[PDB]
Write a protein that binds this ligand. Structure first.
Ligand SMILES: NC(=O)C1=CN([C@@H]2O[C@H](COP(=O)(O)OP(=O)(O)OC[C@H]3O[C@@H](n4cnc5c(N)ncnc54)[C@H](OP(=O)(O)O)[C@@H]3O)[C@@H](O)[C@H]2O)C=CC1
Ligand SMILES: CC1=C(O)C(=O)[C@@H](C)O1
Length: 321
């Protein structure tokens, strides 16, 4: 991992950019010559191979977090997988040539970077990155960080531990697919129940749900069964609180949270990915890609349009970048 030659790293590159808040179909444009970010001393520069989309990307571009956002214009994309090309002077965990992945923004809603992952190169804090598992493709790795870390953090906040039951609202999306897998295979849940629509129930069962509930045919909150943990990934805490055992815990990632449910926003940490590495290498926890993935870098508007439909099954990934 000797430094790259300095003239080998470009100062401009191709990226997707918006200059004003709005719908992605209106405001997201391709720019052939956007500055490559300069790295801070605790950052690395990554040659991007693949990036995932997350709902936060479009919600941020609508302006919903403007009061604590970074200045426009913005190059979107939180999730990245790629190869290190430059390391800052305080970096110790990575060298040039390492294959890495992570969610760029430590605090999703507070000062996310101006220079996201929908670009040929991006700058990332050492602390948000992990080494890419050798058995995962760059597409598979890029799909993981924001979603898997949100799933993990929510289950820790709900104090899930061996033998307990959990109900997942929204089992078939980017986050929910990892809630199911982590609950069963990492947290040792005795019973995992999850909601989705009719055609998605077999997927939930394949990922580790013992009980797949069709929300289009029945109301989970009216079941007599109550759970030690309820993890809402849809935004229906009013109902979620009716499905929890006395003394159990309800967490949500879509507010506002009706007490006793709590809302949190994840903290992005490479250490969480490193903790999960053995499950990813063994295949006990798998990436889940939407069948439309990958989208070429020319088709980022379309990729957002599909994510914005609320129907994605697992992750929407952009490759090759
Ligand atoms: N607070 C935080 O830290 C975070 C918050 N979020 C938020 O969490 C939410 C989920 O994110 P993510 O998983 O990436 O989103 P996705 O867009 O990937 O979720 C799509 C899935 O949602 C399912 N879904 C939609 N409505 C329902 C419903 N009523 N019941 C059950 N399933 C439903 C769909 O299944 P079907 O077609 O069967 O309806 C589809 O498979 C988003 O609002 C996002 O902004 C995400 C990450 C972190
Ligand atoms: C990551 C993230 C989202 O997707 C949200 O909507 C806010 C609550 O934070």
């Amino acid at each position: 991992g000797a430094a790259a030659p300095s003239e080998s790293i470009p100062s401009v590159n191709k990226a997707w950019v918006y200059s004003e808040y709005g719908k992605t179909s209106d405001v997201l444009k391709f720019d052939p010559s956007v500055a490559v970010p300069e790295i801070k001393e605790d950052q690395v520069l990554i040659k991007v191979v693949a990036a995932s989309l997350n709902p936060v990307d479009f919600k941020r571009a609508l302006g919903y977090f403007k009061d604590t956002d970074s200045p426009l214009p913005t190059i979107p994309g939180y999730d990245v997988a790629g190869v290190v090309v430059k390391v800052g002077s305080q970096v110790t965990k990575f060298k040039v040539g390492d294959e890495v992945y992570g969610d760029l923004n430590e605090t999703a809603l507070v000062n996310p970077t101006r220079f996201g992952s929908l670009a040929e190169y991006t700058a990332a804090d050492e602390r948000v990155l992990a080494h890419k598992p050798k058995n995962l493709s760059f597409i598979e790795a890029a799909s993981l960080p924001l979603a898997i870390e949100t799933a993990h953090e929510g289950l820790e906040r709900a104090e899930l531990s061996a033998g307990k039951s959990v109900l997942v609202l929204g089992g078939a999306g980017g986050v929910g697919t990892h809630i199911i897998q982590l609950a069963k295979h990492v947290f040792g849940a005795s019973k995992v129940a999850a909601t989705a629509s009719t055609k998605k129930l077999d997927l939930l069962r394949t990922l580790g749900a013992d009980l797949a509930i069709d929300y289009t045919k029945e109301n989970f909150e009216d079941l007599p069964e109550k759970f030690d943990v309820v993890y809402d990934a849809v935004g229906e805490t009013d109902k979620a609180v009716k499905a929890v055992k006395e003394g159990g815990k309800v967490v949500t990632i879509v507010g506002p949270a009706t007490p006793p449910a709590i809302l949190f926003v994840l903290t992005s940490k490479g250490s969480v990915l490193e903790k999960l590495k053995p499950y990813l290498e063994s295949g006990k926890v798998k990436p889940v890609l939407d069948p439309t993935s990958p989208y070429p870098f020319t088709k980022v508007v379309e990729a957002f349009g599909y994510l914005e439909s609320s129907r994605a099954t697992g992750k929407v990934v952009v490759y090759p970048i």
